[PDB]
Amino acid sequence: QDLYLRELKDTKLAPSTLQDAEGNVKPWNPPQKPNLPELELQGPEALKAYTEQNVETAHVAKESEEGESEPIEEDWLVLDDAEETKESH
Amino acid sequence: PPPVRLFGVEGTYATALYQAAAKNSSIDAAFQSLQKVESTVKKNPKLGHLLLNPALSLKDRNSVIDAIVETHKNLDGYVVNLLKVLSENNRLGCFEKIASDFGVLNDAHNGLLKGTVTSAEPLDPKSFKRIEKALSASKLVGQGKSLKLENVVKPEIKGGLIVELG
């Protein structure tokens, strides 16, 4: 149909100008290529953790806590304390 | 049975007039007095349009109907009785005059604008609707070619919405 074919033409070659050709758009002043492709590509990381989300900051798992291998001082006091607690058993 | 019921709305009077007059011949005879009456009413801007007002008294309504009929024998036929009956039953029947015309067309003329994607104002006065339609359309396109503008084919709106909504 002419109304279909003409619509397809005006909506395809112009769609070519918008997307399929890097001619941006004459009717609209700011091209989306200088707006979306790189800066708004940081919009994904603007919503994400910037230079940190894609990066995934290095955080190595640490060691758990222990008694510093100290039986010279902790063992005797622990024994006395446990025996004192045993006085009401 | 009439050609098709006109779905009432003060068209009951016109439907009954068509049926009764169709008991007789009273076809061109009925429509002729009606056309003369409507022309007479148009011929009097006031007193014939302000006469088509609810405020007219019953004596006033009968008198106005009689005066309209007084234009010689322009009110010949059962249309006189119908006008008098409406004079007390329902004052306004100019739409009933158009409905009587519609019944006359249904009896003899038929036809209405097609449309589809065309806003043309043509007519196809023939009983059949499988032959003359194309000739009428092509003629009205190649002759006159008036303001048949629907602006654009609605399919433009259709495609625009279709693309714009995924």
Coordinates of all heavy atoms in Angstrom, one line a residue, chain B residues 63-126, unseen atoms left out:
Chain B
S63 N -54.1 24.6 14.7 CA -54.2 25.7 13.7 C -53.0 25.8 12.8 O -53.1 26.1 11.6 CB -54.5 27.0 14.5
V64 N -51.8 25.7 13.4 CA -50.6 25.8 12.6 C -50.5 24.6 11.6 O -50.1 24.9 10.4 CB -49.3 25.8 13.5
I65 N -50.8 23.4 12.0 CA -50.9 22.3 11.1 C -51.9 22.6 10.0 O -51.6 22.3 8.8 CB -51.2 21.0 11.8
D66 N -53.0 23.1 10.3 CA -54.1 23.4 9.3 C -53.6 24.5 8.4 O -53.8 24.4 7.1 CB -55.3 23.8 10.0
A67 N -52.9 25.5 8.9 CA -52.4 26.6 8.0 C -51.3 26.1 7.1 O -51.3 26.5 5.9 CB -51.9 27.7 8.9
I68 N -50.5 25.2 7.5 CA -49.5 24.6 6.7 C -50.1 23.8 5.6 O -49.7 23.8 4.4 CB -48.5 23.7 7.5
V69 N -51.2 23.0 6.0 CA -51.9 22.3 5.0 C -52.7 23.2 4.0 O -53.1 22.8 3.0 CB -52.9 21.3 5.7
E70 N -52.9 24.4 4.4 CA -53.8 25.3 3.7 C -53.1 25.7 2.3 O -53.8 26.3 1.5 CB -54.1 26.6 4.5
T71 N -51.8 25.4 2.2 CA -51.2 25.7 0.9 C -51.7 24.8 -0.2 O -51.1 23.8 -0.6 CB -49.6 25.5 1.0
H72 N -52.9 25.2 -0.7 CA -53.7 24.4 -1.6 C -53.8 22.9 -1.2 O -54.1 22.6 -0.1 CB -53.1 24.5 -3.0
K73 N -53.4 22.0 -2.2 CA -53.5 20.6 -1.9 C -52.1 20.0 -1.8 O -51.8 18.9 -2.1 CB -54.2 19.9 -3.1
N74 N -51.2 20.9 -1.3 CA -49.8 20.4 -1.0 C -49.7 19.4 0.1 O -48.7 18.7 0.3 CB -48.9 21.6 -0.7
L75 N -50.8 19.4 0.9 CA -50.9 18.4 2.0 C -51.8 17.3 1.6 O -52.5 16.7 2.4 CB -51.4 19.1 3.3
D76 N -51.8 16.9 0.4 CA -52.6 15.8 -0.1 C -52.2 14.5 0.4 O -51.0 14.2 0.5 CB -52.7 15.9 -1.7
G77 N -53.2 13.6 0.6 CA -52.9 12.3 1.0 C -53.0 12.0 2.5 O -53.4 12.9 3.3
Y78 N -52.5 10.8 3.0 CA -52.6 10.5 4.4 C -51.6 11.3 5.2 O -51.7 11.3 6.4 CB -52.2 9.0 4.6
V79 N -50.7 12.1 4.6 CA -49.8 13.0 5.3 C -50.6 14.0 6.0 O -50.2 14.5 7.1 CB -48.8 13.6 4.3
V80 N -51.8 14.4 5.5 CA -52.6 15.4 6.3 C -53.0 14.8 7.6 O -52.9 15.4 8.7 CB -53.9 15.7 5.5
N81 N -53.5 13.5 7.6 CA -53.9 12.9 8.8 C -52.7 12.7 9.8 O -52.9 12.9 11.0 CB -54.6 11.5 8.5
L82 N -51.6 12.3 9.2 CA -50.4 12.1 10.1 C -50.0 13.4 10.7 O -49.6 13.5 11.9 CB -49.2 11.5 9.3
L83 N -50.0 14.5 10.0 CA -49.7 15.8 10.5 C -50.6 16.2 11.6 O -50.2 16.7 12.7 CB -49.6 16.9 9.4
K84 N -51.9 16.0 11.4 CA -52.9 16.4 12.4 C -52.7 15.5 13.7 O -52.8 16.0 14.8 CB -54.3 16.2 11.9
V85 N -52.4 14.2 13.5 CA -52.2 13.3 14.6 C -51.0 13.8 15.4 O -51.0 13.8 16.7 CB -52.0 11.9 14.1
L86 N -49.9 14.1 14.7 CA -48.7 14.6 15.4 C -49.0 15.9 16.1 O -48.4 16.2 17.1 CB -47.5 14.7 14.5
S87 N -49.9 16.7 15.6 CA -50.2 18.0 16.1 C -50.5 18.0 17.6 O -50.4 19.0 18.3 CB -51.3 18.7 15.3
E88 N -51.1 16.9 18.0 CA -51.3 16.6 19.5 C -50.3 15.6 20.0 O -50.1 15.6 21.2 CB -52.7 16.3 19.7
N89 N -49.8 14.6 19.2 CA -49.1 13.5 19.7 C -47.6 13.9 19.9 O -47.1 13.6 21.0 CB -49.1 12.4 18.7
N90 N -47.0 14.5 18.9 CA -45.6 15.0 19.0 C -45.4 16.1 18.1 O -45.6 15.9 16.9 CB -44.6 13.8 18.8
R91 N -45.0 17.3 18.6 CA -45.0 18.5 17.8 C -43.9 18.4 16.6 O -44.2 18.8 15.5 CB -44.7 19.7 18.7
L92 N -42.8 17.9 16.9 CA -41.6 18.0 16.0 C -41.5 16.7 15.2 O -41.3 15.6 15.7 CB -40.3 18.3 16.7
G93 N -41.5 16.9 13.8 CA -41.4 15.7 12.9 C -40.6 16.1 11.7 O -40.7 15.4 10.7
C94 N -39.8 17.2 11.8 CA -38.9 17.4 10.7 C -37.9 16.3 10.5 O -37.6 15.8 9.4 CB -38.2 18.7 10.9
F95 N -37.4 15.8 11.7 CA -36.7 14.5 11.7 C -37.6 13.4 11.2 O -37.1 12.5 10.5 CB -36.1 14.2 13.1
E96 N -38.9 13.5 11.5 CA -39.8 12.5 11.0 C -40.0 12.7 9.5 O -40.3 11.7 8.7 CB -41.2 12.5 11.7
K97 N -39.9 13.9 9.0 CA -39.9 14.1 7.5 C -38.7 13.5 6.9 O -38.8 12.8 5.8 CB -40.0 15.6 7.2
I98 N -37.5 13.7 7.5 CA -36.3 13.1 7.0 C -36.4 11.5 7.1 O -35.9 10.8 6.2 CB -35.1 13.6 7.7
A99 N -37.1 11.0 8.1 CA -37.3 9.6 8.2 C -38.2 9.0 7.2 O -38.0 7.9 6.7 CB -37.7 9.3 9.7
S100 N -39.3 9.8 6.9 CA -40.1 9.4 5.8 C -39.4 9.4 4.5 O -39.6 8.5 3.7 CB -41.3 10.4 5.7
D101 N -38.5 10.3 4.3 CA -37.6 10.3 3.1 C -36.7 9.1 3.2 O -36.4 8.5 2.1 CB -36.7 11.6 3.1
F102 N -36.2 8.7 4.3 CA -35.4 7.5 4.5 C -36.1 6.3 4.1 O -35.6 5.4 3.4 CB -34.8 7.4 5.9
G103 N -37.4 6.2 4.6 CA -38.2 5.1 4.2 C -38.5 5.1 2.7 O -38.5 4.0 2.1
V104 N -38.7 6.2 2.1 CA -38.9 6.3 0.6 C -37.7 5.8 -0.1 O -37.8 5.0 -1.1 CB -39.2 7.7 0.2
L105 N -36.5 6.2 0.3 CA -35.2 5.7 -0.2 C -35.1 4.2 0.0 O -34.7 3.5 -1.0 CB -34.1 6.4 0.4
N106 N -35.5 3.7 1.1 CA -35.4 2.3 1.4 C -36.4 1.5 0.5 O -36.0 0.4 0.0 CB -35.7 2.0 2.9
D107 N -37.5 2.1 0.2 CA -38.5 1.5 -0.7 C -38.0 1.5 -2.1 O -38.2 0.5 -2.8 CB -39.8 2.2 -0.6
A108 N -37.3 2.5 -2.5 CA -36.9 2.7 -3.9 C -35.5 2.9 -4.2 O -34.9 2.3 -5.1 CB -37.7 3.8 -4.6
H109 N -34.8 3.8 -3.4 CA -33.5 4.3 -3.8 C -32.3 3.5 -3.2 O -31.4 3.1 -3.9 CB -33.4 5.8 -3.4
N110 N -32.3 3.4 -1.8 CA -31.2 2.8 -1.1 C -29.9 3.5 -1.3 O -29.9 4.6 -2.0 CB -31.1 1.3 -1.5
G111 N -28.8 3.0 -0.8 CA -27.5 3.6 -1.0 C -27.1 4.5 0.1 O -27.9 5.3 0.7
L112 N -25.8 4.5 0.4 CA -25.2 5.3 1.4 C -23.7 5.3 1.1 O -23.2 4.4 0.5 CB -25.5 4.9 2.8
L113 N -23.0 6.3 1.7 CA -21.6 6.4 1.5 C -20.9 5.2 2.0 O -21.2 4.7 3.1 CB -21.0 7.7 2.1
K114 N -19.8 4.7 1.3 CA -19.1 3.6 1.8 C -18.2 3.9 3.0 O -18.4 3.4 4.1 CB -18.2 3.0 0.7
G115 N -17.2 4.7 2.8 CA -16.3 5.1 3.8 C -15.0 4.4 3.8 O -14.1 4.8 3.1
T116 N -14.8 3.4 4.7 CA -13.6 2.6 4.8 C -12.4 3.6 5.2 O -12.2 3.9 6.4 CB -13.3 1.8 3.6
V117 N -11.7 4.0 4.2 CA -10.7 5.0 4.3 C -11.0 6.3 3.5 O -10.1 7.1 3.3 CB -9.3 4.5 4.0
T118 N -12.2 6.4 3.0 CA -12.7 7.5 2.2 C -13.8 8.3 2.9 O -14.7 7.6 3.4 CB -13.1 7.1 0.8
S119 N -13.7 9.6 2.9 CA -14.7 10.4 3.5 C -15.7 11.0 2.4 O -16.3 12.1 2.6 CB -14.1 11.5 4.3
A120 N -15.8 10.4 1.3 CA -16.5 10.9 0.2 C -18.0 11.0 0.5 O -18.5 10.3 1.4 CB -16.3 10.1 -1.1
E121 N -18.7 11.8 -0.2 CA -20.2 12.0 0.0 C -20.9 11.6 -1.3 O -21.6 12.4 -1.9 CB -20.5 13.5 0.4
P122 N -20.7 10.4 -1.7 CA -21.4 10.0 -2.9 C -22.7 9.2 -2.7 O -23.1 9.1 -1.5 CB -20.4 9.1 -3.7
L123 N -23.3 8.6 -3.7 CA -24.5 7.8 -3.6 C -24.5 6.8 -4.7 O -23.9 7.0 -5.8 CB -25.7 8.7 -3.7
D124 N -25.1 5.6 -4.5 CA -25.2 4.6 -5.5 C -26.7 4.2 -5.6 O -27.1 3.1 -5.0 CB -24.4 3.4 -5.1
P125 N -27.6 4.9 -6.3 CA -29.0 4.6 -6.2 C -29.3 3.4 -7.1 O -29.9 3.5 -8.2 CB -29.6 5.9 -6.8
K126 N -29.0 2.2 -6.6 CA -29.4 1.0 -7.3 C -29.6 -0.1 -6.3 O -28.9 -0.1 -5.2 CB -28.2 0.6 -8.3

